Design an enzyme around this catalytic site. Sequence first.
Site, mmCIF file in Angstrom:
data_model
loop_
_atom_site.group_PDB
_atom_site.id
_atom_site.type_symbol
_atom_site.label_atom_id
_atom_site.label_comp_id
_atom_site.label_asym_id
_atom_site.label_seq_id
_atom_site.Cartn_x
_atom_site.Cartn_y
_atom_site.Cartn_z
ATOM 1 C CG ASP A 171 -1.839 1.107 1.297
ATOM 2 O OD1 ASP A 171 -1.917 1.961 0.385
ATOM 3 O OD2 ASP A 171 -2.541 1.137 2.307
ATOM 4 C CB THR A 172 1.957 3.518 -2.788
ATOM 5 O OG1 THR A 172 0.688 3.638 -3.475
ATOM 6 C CG2 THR A 172 2.782 2.424 -3.471
ATOM 7 N N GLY A 173 -0.206 4.205 -0.224
ATOM 8 C CA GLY A 173 -0.842 5.321 0.460
ATOM 9 C C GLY A 173 -0.749 5.215 1.970
#
EC number: 3.4.23.16
Lengths: 97, 97
Positions: free
Chosen positions: B25-27
Amino acid sequence: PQITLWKRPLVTIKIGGQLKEALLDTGADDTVLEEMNLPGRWKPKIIGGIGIKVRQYDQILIEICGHKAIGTVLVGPTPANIIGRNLLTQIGCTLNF
Amino acid sequence: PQITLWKRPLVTIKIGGQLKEALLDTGADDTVLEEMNLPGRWKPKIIGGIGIKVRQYDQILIEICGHKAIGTVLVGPTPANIIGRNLLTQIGCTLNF
């Protein structure tokens, strides 16, 4: 562009004639933006997560870091504009390691 | 491996002798895993988002899709194991489009 993840992957987006910053988020199925008005009809929808009530708009044009994409955009009380997979796949975004 | 985003970017991780699935998850700034016990001391911490109370553990070993990384791992009532940027940068993960 190749983007490392030492800092939040924020990009500039243009939508509905406005310029905003948004997070490229691989963990989000959908795109959610803070309050703003958009064209066409909209339907109520609920979204899940860790820590809401959102309006859903379809066929919305969004330019993300220069790449145009059209799709569903959710507009609710989010503390950050989130660009999810439904639009990331449109701009040809991939994770690599 | 290069991973496209048509489906959720789930990978297998091994942590504390257990095997689990987790979302790249890049966020997410941080890594949050569902309940499990870990080694060392832990301190209470609160995390933000769209839709919590988590315990924070440090210097935790996690093997993500075969790449070992050590870092802070948060353990709380999350509906999904999330591998955030603090560990994604350790495995050399980048976004590309």
